[PDB]
């Protein structure tokens, strides 16, 4: 409903290549009442 | 004046909560308008009186 809501979580975690078997929950962070049709995303490059 | 304006043509309804400015030319009929109005292909951009 043209709002972008972006939820982060941060853990420490040891575990070397799998998902951790593991179970948290992930608390609201930004609500963002801005209305677009968004249908792909990128990630960034870095050096 | 004619800076008021609306758009009259278009593919199908609005989802609630949103705003549409693709300036682009409408298909009015079987006629594909290939970036060329011709015919059957109408700009649903239009002021009013």
């Known amino acids: 409903d043209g709002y972008f809501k972006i939820y982060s979580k941060h853990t420490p975690i040891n575990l070397v290549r799998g998902l951790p078997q593991g179970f948290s929950a992930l608390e609201p962070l930004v609500d963002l009442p801005i209305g677009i049709n968004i249908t792909r995303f990128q990630t960034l490059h870095i050096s | ?49």
Not at chain 2, 12 to 27: A, G, V, W
Not at chain 2, 29 to 41: A, H, L, M, R
Request: aromatic share 20%; proline share 6%.
């Open chain 2, 1 to 49: 004046n004619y800076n008021y304006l609306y758009r009259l043509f278009r593919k199908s309804n609005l989802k609630p909560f949103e705003r549409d400015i693709s300036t682009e030319i409408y298909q009015a009929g079987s006629t594909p308008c290939n970036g060329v109005k011709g015919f059957n292909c109408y700009f649903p951009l239009q002021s009013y009186g």
